[PDB]
Design a protein around this ligand. Structure first.
Ligand SMILES: C[C@H](Nc1ncnc(N)c1C#N)c1nn2cccc2c(=O)n1-c1ccccc1
Lengths: 916, 164
């Protein structure tokens, strides 16, 4: 029904109720309200319309003050149609923000308050102050600083058509490759240079050659367009009691709750202490109580370790099994110490997570989150009591008191063996004899092998407190390590906060471009952090508040996992603090979410109508929905989530279509008269598949493309954008001028690349095809991408090959085999350009594959480190050291450079056989 | 663990257990879709009740206000010669109260939904916790057979045929 009966609550206590249109705005509603009010009691006591402001209850179940009266009623989307008038004056600043944050992150901010949790409360206090604090320092800075923040420089690893702002007519000047932005603005310092129809500005001390736009203009074969921008235009946008306790650690296991186990079986609760992955001591186990919904054990579970021997990140881990006189029911982990450093005491209810069947099935799940199960009403839980250890409570010792142990408390033979022992292979496992070597020459490690910190940490006995002091003493005076070495230290294997701190300190030298390359991995590391208030989160917020691209993509990485109970709280709290320090960007992100909300709703209609109607008519039925007042304005004029510099202005409803295949992805086309001749963006909305593995894959192909460019090989890759935005939802960037091999192939493939760019530019298109084939053949080989065929590889009109729909990787495939290198015979023909025995070209191609692969080996450990961190993400195809071992074998890291290069040559030639 | 003597017999059973495993593993995955979708729906209902609660709260704030304001208004303007707007004011307030019952009733209908769904959710979780031990044993039995045959040198071609 197009109109809605709405309840109106006047401030006198008077109640009015009548229909309005769903698409009517609040300003109009108020005019109709007043007109009706006349004919009710107490009208004369009311002030005028403008003295009041509507209130409603959100979809998130919170009171919202509707300050902006241009919003439509259907867009406000109140729970029930109930509007209540209140005084327009009323400290609105914090009110309207909190409202937006809730509707933007999806979770209501009241849901944090309701937890009655001091850790949560502290976090929200400290960070929202910090992010506000940052924001204020942003506004305090001038025009140069804010431009740097707003839109950072997009840089690489003829003529120029400049023009003055606010003018249709322009003047086509000419400039060559190398020239500085100051030198450009000469042919000044008050202005800046801006790319036409995009939020992308040229500034700083870099030359014109090193900017992405100017480079991108050359290979397409087109003239650029830039624009001068006065500071007024920029500012307009800117404005708008110690470890003496030698008592063995014990815990009381009291009772369970809400257990949905089988009645004939029997319940048992196994448990164990852990420092990350390693066991502090052996696992104890409960008595076999009969299966109740409310079981009762009442046992003192004493462990083989003292309270004085517990490390800061000691973690007790529980698991409830069910046995026929075995079924894992549920698991739940606890940190022994708390977030303010106190050793926990008293009763504690552990709301447990349900046990997913693994292929292996370990005793407990120590890797699993310390975060509680939010589903407290329905979840099973375990009542336990952590006892009173001393008459007044105890904290973990302070750094000064830790340093006191090292404060007061070398053979040439020993030395030479350590050089061998610590210089050798990737890792594997050292022996207890050699572990003592590493512990013995542990200062000599700090003095001569600074980058072997990870190995020394592993060999440290974390179940003995004297060793923990000795280690942490050395770590405090440890020399700064590289980024590569630092990323390794971020892995779950090193839980101690001092390692985490040292890691982040070494990561602080990261440039923003480099930090962006690892952001996905850094976000996943949050998942296994112990406490909310941590140095990684502070790091990410600090960097997000300083760089709006970092902040943008930080937002979406977190937003897109808000539907996951294990991270919802943590990520929700970060998004809140990000929003508070980024009030302007909050508005852009809102218009995106509102777009995304509409695209899901639009995709639902295509999903219903595709099952009934045929394809050509359903396309027109999609348009009819898109032409509407709500669907047009919400989809129009927004920054792309895939690239906030891209401006998606006017939707091309006629050009918009869909694929009637599987998850019915929607093809949304955009046009805008500012961008240029090739100024039409496209985006693929897609709901039903999980895009995270797709994103990892593409990002890893990006990194390959960067690494090759640094060493001087441009393999003409197409690293098109892919952003998960929600629960099995995201955008993929449309690549224009392209088609599948299948559709071209339905002798034929050679004729297509001839037609688009004939004559002289054909040889360039062959050079584009050969160059990109090299890259994508190595990339897919190294990453182990399988199920590669006609309909999931595309070719661009320029010549460039690129891959799509990365379903599987690292050898994984059906319900797991080593992927051979793949030269397709069709593709080999195009490289040999028609002729049969074209050794000239094909030797140079193989020459490039050998080079590409070699460069990737040199940064092998980077890929291992990044993939290591992604084990956190819980992707089914990347969940263990064996999935990582795939890359070690594909990059051939354990062999010499000569050995790997010949191994690759053998695999190449093995492919060249199977071609025929 | 292996209850057969000859390769071909053992291989035939390997096929049964692998087929049993794959069928059961599918039944669990089917129930896991139901389970998780239900959690999602429950979480939605649970917040919708919060929205009802918070809406009813707003309606009761009106009721407090009209009571107070009516009383104050009547006293300032005496209720003397002017009594025409009192029956109006009171009749409006009957409508206000009457609307609150409708809303209170809807909350009551949703709560009864949430309760029915919550019991389904628990029945899903019961069903999967009885599947779990079967799934684990069938996996462990399947593997024992694959071992047995591999130890005996049976060729991968025969094993692939038995796993299809
Ligand atoms: C199959 C293709 N996928 C992509 N196309 C363009 N850019 C991309 N980044 C992708 C991807 N992934 C593609 N995807 N798609 C989703 C919805 C509609 C379409 C579509 O029409 N094509 C398509 C088919 C033939 C030729 C050209 C395009």
């Amino acid at each position: 029904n197009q109109s809605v009966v709405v309840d109106f609550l006047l401030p006198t206590g008077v109640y009015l109720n009548f229909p309005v249109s769903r698409n009517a705005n609040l300003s109009t509603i108020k005019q109709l309200l007043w007109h009706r009010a006349q004919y009710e009691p107490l009208f004369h006591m009311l002030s005028g319309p403008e003295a009041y402001v509507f209130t409603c209850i959100n979809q998130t179940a919170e009171q919202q003050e509707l300050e902006d009266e241009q919003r439509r009623l259907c867009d406000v989307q109140p729970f029930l149609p109930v509007l209540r008038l209140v005084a327009r004056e009323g400290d609105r600043v914090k009110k309207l923000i909190n409202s937006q944050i809730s509707l933007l992150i999806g979770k209501g901010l009241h849901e944090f308050d309701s937890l009655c949790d001091p850790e949560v409360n502290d976090f929200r206090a400290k960070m929202c102050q910090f992010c506000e604090e940052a924001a204020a320092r942003r506004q305090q800075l001038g025009w140069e600083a804010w431009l740097q923040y707003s839109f950072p420089l997009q840089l690489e690893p003829l003529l120029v058509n400049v023009k003055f702002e606010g003018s249709e007519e322009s003047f086509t000047f000419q400039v060559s490759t190398k020239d500085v932005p100051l030198a450009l603005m000469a042919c000044p310092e008050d202005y800046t240079l801006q790319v036409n129809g995009r939020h992308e500005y040229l500034y700083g001390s870099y030359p014109l050659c090193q900017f992405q736009y100017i480079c991108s203009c050359l290979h397409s074969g087109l003239t650029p367009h830039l624009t001068m921008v006065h500071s007024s235009s920029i500012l307009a946008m800117r404005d708008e009691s110690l470890w003496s306790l030698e008592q063995p650690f014990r815990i009381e296991l009291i009772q369970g709750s809400k257990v949905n186990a089988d009645e004939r079986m029997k319940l048992v609760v196994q448990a164990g202490l852990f420092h990350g992955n390693e066991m502090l001591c052996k696992t104890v186990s409960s008595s076999e109580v009969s299966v109740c919904s409310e079981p009762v054990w009442k046992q003192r579970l004493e462990f083989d370790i003292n309270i004085c021997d517990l490390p800061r990140m000691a973690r007790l881990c529980f698991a409830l099994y069910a046995v026929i006189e075995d079924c894992p029911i549920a698991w739940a982990n606890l940190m022994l110490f708390d977030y303010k450093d106190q050793l926990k005491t008293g009763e504690r209810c552990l709301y447990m997570w349900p046990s997913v069947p693994d292929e292996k099935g370990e005793l407990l799940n120590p890797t699993g989150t310390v975060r509680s199960n939010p589903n407290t009403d329905s979840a099973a839980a375990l009542l336990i009591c952590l006892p009173e250890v001393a008459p007044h409570p105890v904290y973990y010792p302070a750094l000064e008191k830790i340093l006191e142990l090292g404060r007061h408390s070398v053979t040439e033979e020993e030395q030479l063996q350590l050089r061998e022992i610590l210089e050798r292979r990737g890792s594997g496992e050292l022996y207890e004899h050699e572990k003592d070597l590493v512990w013995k020459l542990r200062h000599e490690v700090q003095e001569h092998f600074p980058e072997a910190l990870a190995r020394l940490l592993l060999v440290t006995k974390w179940n003995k407190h004297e060793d923990v002091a000795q280690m942490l003493y050395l770590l405090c005076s440890w020399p700064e390590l590289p980024v590569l070495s630092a990323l390794e230290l971020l892995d779950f294997s090193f839980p101690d906060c001092h390692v985490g701190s040292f890691a982040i300190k070494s990561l602080r030298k990261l440039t923003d471009d480099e930090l962006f390359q690892y952001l996905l991995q850094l976000v996943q590391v949050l998942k296994y952090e112990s406490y909310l208030d941590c140095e990684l989160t502070k790091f990410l917020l600090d960097r997000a508040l300083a760089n709006r691209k970092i902040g943008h993509f930080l937002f979406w990485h977190l937003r897109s996992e808000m539907h996951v109970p294990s991270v919802a709280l943590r990520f929700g709290l970060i998004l809140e603090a990000y929003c508070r320090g980024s009030t302007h960007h909050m508005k852009v992100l809102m218009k995106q979410g509102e777009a995304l909300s509409k695209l899901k709703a639009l995709n639902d209609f295509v999903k219903l109508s595709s099952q009934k109607t045929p394809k050509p008519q359903t396309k027109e039925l999609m348009h009819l929905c898109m032409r509407q007042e709500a669907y047009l304005e919400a989809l129009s004029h927004l920054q792309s989530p895939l690239d906030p510099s891209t401006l998606l202005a006017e939707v091309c409803v006629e050009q918009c279509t869909f694929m009637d295949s599987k998850m019915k992805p929607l093809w949304i086309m955009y046009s805008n008269e500012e961008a240029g001749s090739g100024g039409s963006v496209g985006i693929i909305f897609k709901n039903g598949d999980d895009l995270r593995q797709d994103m990892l894959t593409l990002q890893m192909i990006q990194l390959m493309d960067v690494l090759w460019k640094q060493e001087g090989l441009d393999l003409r890759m197409t690293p098109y954008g892919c952003l998960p935005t929600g629960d099995r939802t995201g955008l993929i960037e449309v690549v224009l001028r392209s088609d599948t091999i299948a559709n071209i192939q339905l002798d034929a493939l050679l004729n297509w690349l001839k037609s688009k760019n004939p004559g002289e530019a054909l040889d360039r298109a062959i050079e584009e095809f050969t160059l990109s084939c090299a890259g994508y053949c190595v990339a897919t080989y190294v990453l182990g991408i399988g199920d590669r065929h006609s309909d999931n590889i595309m070719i661009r009109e320029s010549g460039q090959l690129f891959h799509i729909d990365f379903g599987h990787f690292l050898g994984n495939f059906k319900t797991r085999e080593r992927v051979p290198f793949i030269l397709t015979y069709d593709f080999v023909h195009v490289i040999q350009q028609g002729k049969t025995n074209n050794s000239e070209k094909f030797e140079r191609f193989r020459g490039y594959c050998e080079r590409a692969y070699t460069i990737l080996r040199r940064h092998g450990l980077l890929f291992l480190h990044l993939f290591a961190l992604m084990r956190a993400a819980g992707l089914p195809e990347l969940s263990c050291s064996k999935d990582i071992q795939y890359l070690k074998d594909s990059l051939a890291l354990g062999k010499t450079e000569e050995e790997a290069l010949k191994h690759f040559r053998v695999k190449f030639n093995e492919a060249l056989r199977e071609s025929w | 663990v292996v209850k057969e003597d000859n390769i071909e017999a053992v291989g035939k059973k390997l096929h049964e257990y692998n087929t049993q495993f794959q069928e059961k593993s599918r039944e669990y995955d089917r129930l896991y879709e139901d389970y998780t979708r239900t959690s999602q729906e429950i979480q939605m209902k649970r917040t919708a009740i919060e929205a009802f609660n918070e809406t009813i709260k707003i309606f009761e704030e009106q009721c407090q206000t009209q009571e107070r304001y009516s009383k104050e208004y009547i006293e300032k303007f005496k209720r003397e010669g002017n009594e025409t707007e009192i029956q109006r004011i009171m009749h409006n307030y009957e409508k206000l109260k009457s609307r609150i019952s409708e809303i209170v009733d809807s909350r009551r209908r949703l709560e009864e939904d949430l309760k029915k769904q919550a019991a389904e959710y628990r029945e899903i979780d019961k069903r999967m916790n009885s599947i779990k031990p079967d799934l684990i044993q069938l996996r462990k039995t399947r593997d024992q057979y694959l071992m047995w045959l591999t130890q005996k040198g049976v060729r991968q071609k025969k094993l692939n045929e038995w796993l299809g």
